């Protein structure tokens, strides 16, 4: 068996995605659920052997679970200070960058 | 500090674009200076 | 070419045909933004 | 020559600017398996 | 009688020597810094 | 599943750090392989010619090594500018 | 609940051993794309 | 059911009949060299050893008996082609009769040792199971392997007491068997040198007999025991496969590339003689010496032996052959005749025009003459509606030095043309197609067979060493998987693979 | 290390003329950027020979021979000059059989060198030069003929020659203009 | 407490994100010199003193035209180390005299036995058995006898494959107009175990998408599915029934089908493997002498095989005075074999 709960999706903030990377859907669950061909569905879920195994696939072995994301990345720690500090980095090494593609070429 | 995260799909878009970019000059090359036939 | 009154707008043809296969690309850049739901 | 240089000189910058946002959780790591 | 090839031979043993000693010198010091239990 | 110890990808790549640190080392490579060409350094660290040193006054057609053991005296003659 | 990970580990050596050289050939290689015979 | 491709596994455990059926592969490939040499003797003409040699009759066995020292023939002819004198039991028929009566013997060893399988000797004393001591059984086996070893190189190559191997002469004129004196320097190491041969198998025996004598001693370490599955026979396999197959790469490649243990008299020629002139260049030389001593270029060229001018020719090339192009060299463009003379082309005015000898790589190759700057001067055009080189228009003649037609000459193209066909073959040779209806395609020497047999088992061989080499390691989930492994297989579960006290 | 940069935004192609100023002893032209320098040595007197790099059939050659006069008209009329040089066509001298299924060619003919222009011009300096264009055409058919431009003057007691050839399938789409360009650079 | 190797054996064989193991002491370090040696000679190096062609990007090459040339033929079949004889020391002669090639020829040679022992080494920590290793040792067969094994049984390895897209492309070409290679019976082997394997790798994922079960309500199929789920996700039985009404045979065992997978492609590279080894000493399937003999006797007698003689004879002709520029052919348009017109 699997618990979808340990599986790092928890921290999904659209219901949607959070469903969709879980592999379950409630709306598909039910037994007057129609296709958008016009199928209706067998009373399955996405998976008909989930809960004997816990979950589909998608929430077996998901590639992007936020909740193991560390903390540290939600901020940069230098904050606007650091930011600034970027971005005068960025103009002065662009200036040299182009001065030295422009020296460096036969241009003029 | 600042807090938030790039959203991962701007970080596709703009990989994507440098990318192209990139392939447009080779291609662009293809046509000019050396190993055009010109 | 174009008529001479429509010379200066040259450039913009030049990029014109270009656009419908931009679409694609702007479907797949939508659903990316929906995180492909 | 110096052309070799020149482009080594780059590097200054670039090291600087990735220790001045790196160097702390560097240390960080360097001491919890220390 | 030892001809300038000879030696590089001989260098080069001696190089790949050291090239093996520097990897096996590094992993024993990341094994020791980074050991299990 | 589960996973082997390593930040995720995904967590990196949208951390404002990881992107103030690579607007400047991935844009430097770049740059430091636009001065590895320009500067002329490929073509003397490889030896490939340049587009006027392909052929000489004194040989106008391909060149062909033509000895084993002197092969490194004969490249140089070939390779005179 | 908290995660904290290295930043320096045996993956990062390997997306950098071929992440830098590569960026480095793409600027040579886009270098030479302006080179006139 | 056991499936067809794993009926000799029941040998596996079985000491006893393992011997019986190793016992039979020995007799086996016994009897083989016994029944290819008496063909082979049955079919060799040893009339003409300068223009029809061993090598051109497609005999494959008689250079390996002519290179360790057997020469003489019951018939009372010799390989050099002098009389035999007394031949006594060591003959070519001698020892195809002897690798015969040996197969019987083992072939009979063999039923006795599989039907007494069950010897004591085989029994492990502490647990009474079948077992062997491969650790101590490979010390026995390589003391022997060093003790016979050393004594070929020291008894039997060195001349003390055997006869020798076959040394020749650089250009292959002169070769006979003699003894060699083992060379100790450097030199030992030059693999055209037949006094390495010599001191390697005795300092190699040597060695092989101190090996067995520690390999008969010395306890195999635990962890090395349990890490190359010493117990289990199969590792034994894996390792000698590996070994075989290492010694055939070698074993190939210096037969392709020649050395003192493949001589031209006895394999043929080398490919890599014609591409670099090695026999041309000689030629010329003696050539050119003869007319330092004011001798006329018609005598000089009668000087130079028959046997010689042979080797430069492209027929004789192991690198012009089919793959179904099957055998002799004489089945291919004949019965080597005699030798018309090297043929010289003059221009009109006089100067001489070389025709440019076919490389190893073409099929065919355009005919065109060079003159002494290297200028093409004439050719036999394709395209015969405005040439600008045909050999009409240039006057070209041929006239023929030593051989049979020395002093004739031809000016006529048609003949002029069909001697430059046969020019850029190298030297011109007279060929018999009529006694064996030879259909005029090359064929390769046995130096090209042997290297394409053992270069083609070489890289079977190497799928030997990975597939039972993999079996004896992997012998634990021969017949599949454990059931329940999900645990151990999850990714990040332990630090360490496979290692369940790593839990993280 | 040479230490020169690489030409980075040039602007400028060093040689688009699509010919090279070849200086010899005593003549000069403009030979083809394409062509490369060839060993092949097809008359007597060949001082220069230039093949095509593509095609081997589009060549030029230039010929110093001794023939002692002081001007072209010594050596005869131009149509007299033509026939005495006309083993600078090719022959035909290896097929020696009769035949008579080459459409478009005499009896036992395989070959024709049809004469198209013949004329006489003069340099700037004054030595006249006897220029000739001529299609040959064989019954093989190659190329669909070959164009022969030769252009001979007499100096100095030597006959300077140059033939170009050009392969008429090449002339047609394009090598014309090189053909015709080295034609109209030989000056002696 | 514990010995060198048991330490290092922890670190080495530690469950990371990229598994090094004690076989990646042998593959990183050969397989990224390897791969370098490929980039920067592609990039970089020239092939102009060694081949007279241009084969990097600086040059003016593009991906499909650039490559990493073998040495001149004079060179033969020197292994041509940085402190070799040739080039003794001096890395930029060393690249013009194309000692990058037996560089990349070399440690690209170890990488092939470093991955198989990593294959070896990861079965034997999971706990599988070694098939995947074995299934490589075919690619590893084609590329020793195509890169190693054919240039040491011809002049030298002036006439190896060269690594570059077009360079193969010569390659190949070579191959028939010289060797006849399409004529082989281990070519005609090694393309019906490749064009075999693509049939049974088609043919097989389409049978198991389209006997799925319904394990779902959704369209999209891929998602009903769980790695432990223990009933099957295909019927077989279905399966089975449609390819013996279809075809008249089809697998009944599951095991024995994923067995034939892995035969068909490995046989087919090994025994194209055999084929090269015999061109290694032009030992080649060249021509059938009976039809050559009628051909010739017979000047009425044509066959679609004596059509692709004369196709290779313009191969060699034509080919030969640029491909081997060592060999100095310079051959007079009018010896050139030509057909009518064209
Ligand atoms: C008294 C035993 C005896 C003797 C004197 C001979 C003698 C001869 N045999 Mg015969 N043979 C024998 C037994 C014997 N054989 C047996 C028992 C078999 C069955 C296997 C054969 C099968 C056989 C065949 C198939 C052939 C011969 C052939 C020959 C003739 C040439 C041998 C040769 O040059 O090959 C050279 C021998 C070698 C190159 C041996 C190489 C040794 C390898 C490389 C061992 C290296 C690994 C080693 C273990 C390293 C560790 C030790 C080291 C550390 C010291 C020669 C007259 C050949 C022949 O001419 O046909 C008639 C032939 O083809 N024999
Ligand atoms: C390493 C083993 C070896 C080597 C190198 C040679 C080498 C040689 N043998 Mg030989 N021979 C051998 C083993 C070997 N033999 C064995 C084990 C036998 C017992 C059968 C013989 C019996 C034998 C005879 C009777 C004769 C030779 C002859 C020759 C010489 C001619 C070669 C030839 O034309 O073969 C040609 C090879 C081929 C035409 C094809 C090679 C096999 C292909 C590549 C394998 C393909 C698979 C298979 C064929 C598919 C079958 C399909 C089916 C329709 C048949 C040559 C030097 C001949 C000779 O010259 O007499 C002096 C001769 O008549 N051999
Ligand atoms: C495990 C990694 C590995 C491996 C297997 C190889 C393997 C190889 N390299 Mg490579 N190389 C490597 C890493 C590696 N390299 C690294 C990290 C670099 C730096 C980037 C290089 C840079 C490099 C260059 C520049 C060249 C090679 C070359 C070669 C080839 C021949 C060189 C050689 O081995 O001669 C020497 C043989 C030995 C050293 C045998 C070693 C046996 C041990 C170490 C002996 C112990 C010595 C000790 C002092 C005991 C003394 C004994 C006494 C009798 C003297 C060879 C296939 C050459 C090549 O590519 O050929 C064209 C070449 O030019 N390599
Ligand atoms: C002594 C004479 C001159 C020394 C000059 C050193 C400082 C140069 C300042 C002028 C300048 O712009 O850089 C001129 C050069 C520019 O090239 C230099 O190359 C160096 C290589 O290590 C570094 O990359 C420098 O950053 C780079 O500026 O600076 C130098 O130092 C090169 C001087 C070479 C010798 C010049 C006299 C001969
Ligand atoms: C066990 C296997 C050993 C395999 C190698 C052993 C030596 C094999 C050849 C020995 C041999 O031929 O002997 C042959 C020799 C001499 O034998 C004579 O050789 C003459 C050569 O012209 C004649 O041909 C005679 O006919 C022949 O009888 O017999 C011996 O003296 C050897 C005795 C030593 C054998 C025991 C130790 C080995
Ligand atoms: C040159 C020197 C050559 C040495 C050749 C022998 C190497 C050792 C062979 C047996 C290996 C072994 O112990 O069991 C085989 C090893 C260890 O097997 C066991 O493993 C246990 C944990 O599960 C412990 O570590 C035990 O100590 C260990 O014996 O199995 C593996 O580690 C899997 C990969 C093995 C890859 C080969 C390792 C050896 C490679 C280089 C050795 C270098 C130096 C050794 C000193
Ligand atoms: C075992 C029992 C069952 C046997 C079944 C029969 C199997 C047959 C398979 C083919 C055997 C015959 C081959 C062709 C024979 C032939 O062409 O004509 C018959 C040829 C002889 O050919 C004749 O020879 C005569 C002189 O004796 C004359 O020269 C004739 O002109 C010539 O035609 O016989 C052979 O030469 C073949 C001998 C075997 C050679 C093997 C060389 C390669 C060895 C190993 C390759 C290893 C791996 C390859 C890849 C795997
Ligand atoms: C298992 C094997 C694992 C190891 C394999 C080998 C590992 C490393 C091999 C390299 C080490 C040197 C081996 C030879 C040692 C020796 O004897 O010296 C051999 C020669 C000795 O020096 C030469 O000797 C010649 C003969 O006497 C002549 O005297 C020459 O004049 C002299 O230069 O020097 C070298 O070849 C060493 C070169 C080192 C190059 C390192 C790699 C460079 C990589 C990139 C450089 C880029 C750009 C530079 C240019 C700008
Ligand atoms: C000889 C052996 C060769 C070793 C391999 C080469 C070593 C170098 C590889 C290291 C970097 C690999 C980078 C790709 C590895 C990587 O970054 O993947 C990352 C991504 C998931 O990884 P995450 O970092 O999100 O992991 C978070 C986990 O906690 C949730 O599963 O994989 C996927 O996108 C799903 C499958 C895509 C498969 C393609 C991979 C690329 C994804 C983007 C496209
Ligand atoms: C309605 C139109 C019919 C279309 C024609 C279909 C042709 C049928 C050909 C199948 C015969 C091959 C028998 C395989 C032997 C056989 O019957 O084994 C039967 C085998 C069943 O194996 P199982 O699953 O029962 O295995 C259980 C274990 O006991 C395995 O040993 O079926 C297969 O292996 C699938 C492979 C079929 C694909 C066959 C390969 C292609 C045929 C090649 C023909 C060569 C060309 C000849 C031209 C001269
Ligand atoms: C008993 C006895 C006797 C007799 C014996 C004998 C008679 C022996 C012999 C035997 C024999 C007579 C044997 C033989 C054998 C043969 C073999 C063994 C071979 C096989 C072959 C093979 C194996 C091959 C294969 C193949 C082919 C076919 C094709 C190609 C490829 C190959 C080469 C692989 C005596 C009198 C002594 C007395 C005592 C007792
Ligand atoms: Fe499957």
């Given amino acids: 068996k699997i618990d979808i709960s340990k599986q790092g999706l928890n921290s999904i903030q659209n219901e949607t995605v959070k469903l969709n990377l879980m592999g379950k859907s409630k709306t598909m669950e039910s037994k007057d659920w129609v296709d958008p061909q016009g199928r209706k569905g067998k009373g399955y879920g996405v998976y008909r052997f989930a809960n004997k195994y816990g979950a589909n696939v998608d929430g077996y072995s998901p590639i992007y679970t936020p909740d193991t994301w560390s903390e540290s990345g939600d901020s940069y720690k230098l904050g606007t200070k650091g930011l600034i500090a970027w971005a005068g980095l960025i103009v002065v090494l662009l200036g040299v960058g182009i001065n030295l593609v422009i020296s460096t070429s036969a241009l003029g | 500090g600042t807090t938030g995260r790039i959203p991962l799909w701007l970080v596709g878009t703009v990989a994507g674009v440098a990318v192209i970019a990139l392939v ?15 | 070419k174009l008529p001479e009154a429509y010379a200066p707008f040259d450039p913009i043809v030049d990029v014109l045909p270009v656009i419908p296969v931009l679409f694609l690309l702007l479907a797949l850049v939508w659903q990316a933004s929906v995180s492909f739901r | 020559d110096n052309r070799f240089g020149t482009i080594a000189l780059l590097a200054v910058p670039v090291i600087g600017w990735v220790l001045f946002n790196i160097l702390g959780p560097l240390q960080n790591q360097l001491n919890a398996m220390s | 009688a030892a001809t300038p090839s000879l030696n590089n031979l001989i260098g080069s043993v001696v190089a790949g020597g050291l090239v093996l000693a520097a990897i096996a010198g590094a992993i024993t010091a990341v094994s020791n810094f980074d050991s299990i239990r | 599943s589960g996973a082997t110890g390593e930040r995720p990808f995904s967590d990196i790549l949208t951390s404002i750090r990881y992107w103030v640190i690579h607007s400047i080392t991935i844009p430097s490579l770049f740059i430091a392989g636009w001065l590895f060409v320009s500067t002329g350094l490929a073509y003397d660290v490889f030896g490939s010619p340049r587009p006027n040193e392909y052929f000489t006054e004194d040989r106008q057609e391909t060149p062909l090594i033509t000895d084993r053991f002197n092969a490194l005296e004969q490249v140089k003659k070939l390779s005179e500018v | 609940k908290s995660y904290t990970y290295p930043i320096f580990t045996v993956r990062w050596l390997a997306v950098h051993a071929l992440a830098v050289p590569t960026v480095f050939f793409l600027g040579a290689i886009t270098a030479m794309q302006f080179i006139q015979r | 059911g ?143 392997s060093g003790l016979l070893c050393f004594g070929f190189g020291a008894f039997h190559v060195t001349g003390l007491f055997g006869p020798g191997i076959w040394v020749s002469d650089p250009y292959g004129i002169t070769g006979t068997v003699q003894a060699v004196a083992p060379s100790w320097d450097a030199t030992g190491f030059d693999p055209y040198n037949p006094g390495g041969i010599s001191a390697h198998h005795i300092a190699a025996g040597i060695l092989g007999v101190l090996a067995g004598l520690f390999h008969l001693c010395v306890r195999p370490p635990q962890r090395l025991y349990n890490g190359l599955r010493m117990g289990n026979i199969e590792t034994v396999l894996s390792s000698s496969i590996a070994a075989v197959f290492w010694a055939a790469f070698v074993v190939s490649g210096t037969m392709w590339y020649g050395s003192a243990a493949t001589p031209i008299e006895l394999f043929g020629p080398t490919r890599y003689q014609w591409d670099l002139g090695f026999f041309q260049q000689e030629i010329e030389r003696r050539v050119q010496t003869s007319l330092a001593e004011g001798k006329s270029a018609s005598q000089a060229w009668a000087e130079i032996p028959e046997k010689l001018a042979f080797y430069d020719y492209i027929g004789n090339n192991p690198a012009k052959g089919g793959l179904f192009r099957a055998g002799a060299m004489n089945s291919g463009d004949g019965i080597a ?25 073409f099929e065919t190759f355009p005919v065109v003459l060079l003159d002494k700057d290297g200028v093409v001067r004439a050719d036999v055009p394709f395209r015969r509606s405005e040439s600008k080189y045909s050999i009409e228009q240039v006057g070209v003649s041929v006239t023929f030095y030593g051989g049979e037609l020395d002093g004739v000459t031809f000016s006529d193209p048609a003949t002029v043309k069909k001697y430059a066909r046969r020019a850029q073959l190298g030297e011109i040779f007279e060929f018999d197609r009529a006694t064996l209806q030879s259909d005029g395609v090359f064929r390769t020497s046995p130096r090209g067979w042997f290297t394409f047999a053992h270069l083609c088992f070489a890289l079977l061989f190497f799928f030997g060493h990975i597939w039972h080499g993999a079996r004896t390691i992997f012998r634990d989930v021969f017949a599949g998987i454990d059931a329940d492994l999900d645990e151990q297989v999850e990714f990040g579960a332990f630090l360490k693979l496979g290692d369940t006290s790593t839990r993280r | 290390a040479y230490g020169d940069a690489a030409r980075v935004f040039a602007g400028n192609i060093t040689n688009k003329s699509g010919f090279i100023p070849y200086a010899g002893e005593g003549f000069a032209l403009l030979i083809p950027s394409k062509w490369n320098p060839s060993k092949e040595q097809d008359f007597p007197g060949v001082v220069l020979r230039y093949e095509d790099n593509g095609d081997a059939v589009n ?78 055409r064989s019954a093989d058919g190659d190329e669909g003929g070959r164009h022969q431009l030769i252009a001979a003057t007499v100096s100095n007691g030597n006959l300077y020659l140059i033939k170009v050839q050009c392969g008429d399938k090449r002339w047609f789409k394009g090598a014309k203009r090189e053909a015709i360009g080295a034609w109209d650079s030989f000056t002696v | 407490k514990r010995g060198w190797f048991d330490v290092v054996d922890d670190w080495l064989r530690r469950d990371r994100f990229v598994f090094v193991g004690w076989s990646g002491l042998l593959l990183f370090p050969t397989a990224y010199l390897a791969l370098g040696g490929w980039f920067t000679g592609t990039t970089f190096v020239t092939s102009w003193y060694t081949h ?59 990488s092939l036995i470093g991955f198989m022992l990593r294959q070896f080494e990861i079965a034997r920590s999971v706990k599988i058995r070694p098939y995947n290793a074995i299934a490589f040792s075919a690619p590893i067969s084609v590329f020793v006898s195509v890169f190693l094994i054919y240039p040491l049984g011809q002049s030298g390895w002036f ?95 599951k095991r024995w089908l994923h067995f034939f997978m892995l035969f068909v492609p490995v046989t087919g590279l090994w025994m194209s493997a055999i084929g090269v080894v015999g061109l290694a000493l032009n030992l080649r399937a060249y021509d059938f002498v009976s039809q050559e003999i009628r051909a010739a006797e017979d000047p009425e007698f044509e066959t679609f095989y004596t059509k692709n003689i004369l196709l290779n004879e313009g191969i060699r002709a034509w080919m030969a005075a640029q491909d081997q520029p060592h060999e100095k052919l310079v051959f007079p348009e009018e010896v050139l074999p030509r057909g009518n017109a064209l």
Avoid at chain 8, 39 to 61: C, H, I, K, T
Avoid at chain 8, 337 to 355: M, T
């Fill in chain 8, 337 to 361: 005749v005699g030798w018309l003379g090297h043929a010289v082309f003059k221009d009109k005015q006089g100067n001489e025009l070389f025709v440019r000898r076919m490389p190893t790589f």
């Fill in chain 8, 2 to 144: 056991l499936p067809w491709y794993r009926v000799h596994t029941v040998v596996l455990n079985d000491p006893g009949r393992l011997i019986a059926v190793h016992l039979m592969h020995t007799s086996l490939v016994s009897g083989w060299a016994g029944s290819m040499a008496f063909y082979e003797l049955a079919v060799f003409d040893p009339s003409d050893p300068v223009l029809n040699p061993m090598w051109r009759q497609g005999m494959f066995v008689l250079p390996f008996m002519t290179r360790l020292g057997i020469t003489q023939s019951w018939g009372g002819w010799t390989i050099s082609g002098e009389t035999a004198s007394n031949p006594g039991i060591w003959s070519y028929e001698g020892v195809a009769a002897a690798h015969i009566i040996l197969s019987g013997l083992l072939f009979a060893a063999s039923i006795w040792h599989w039907v007494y399988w069950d010897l004591e000797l085989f029994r492990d004393p502490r647990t009474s199971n079948p077992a062997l001591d491969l650790p101590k059984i490979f010390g026995i086996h390589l003391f022997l």
């Fill in chain 2, 24 to 38: 447009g000059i080779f291609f662009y090359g293809s046509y000019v200076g050396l190993g055009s036939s010109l």
């Fill in chain 9, 59 to 136: 060549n030029l050659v230039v010929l110093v021979q001794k023939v002692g006069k002081n001007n072209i008209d010594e050596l005869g009329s131009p149509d007299k000059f033509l026939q005495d040089n006309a083993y600078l066509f090719g022959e035909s001298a290896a097929f020696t059989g009769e035949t008579l299924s080459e459409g478009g060619f005499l009896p036992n003919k395989v070959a024709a060198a049809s004469v198209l222009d013949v004329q006489e011009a003069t340099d700037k300096k004054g030595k006249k030069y006897y220029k000739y264009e001529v299609l040959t």
């Fill in chain 10, 52 to 110: 007279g062609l241009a084969s990097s990007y600086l040059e003016g090459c593009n991906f499909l035209t650039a490559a990493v040339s073998t040495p001149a033929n004079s060179m033969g079949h020197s292994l041509l180390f940085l402190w070799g004889p040739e080039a003794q020391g001096d890395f930029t002669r060393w690249c013009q005299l194309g000692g990058l090639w037996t560089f990349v020829a070399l440690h690209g040679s170890f």
């Fill in chain 10, 159 to 253: 006439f190896a494959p060269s690594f570059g897209v077009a360079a193969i492309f010569r390659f190949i070409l070579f191959f028939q107009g010289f060797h006849n290679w399409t004529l082989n019976p281990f070519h005609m082997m090694g393309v019906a175990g490749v064009l075999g394997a693509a049939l049974l790798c088609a043919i097989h994922g389409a049978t198991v998408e389209n006997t799925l079960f319904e394990d779902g309500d959704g369209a999209n199929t891929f998602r009903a599915f769980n790695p432990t789920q223990a009933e099957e996700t295909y019927s077989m039985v279905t399966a089975n029934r449609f390819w013996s009404q279809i075809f008249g045979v089809a697998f009944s065992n």
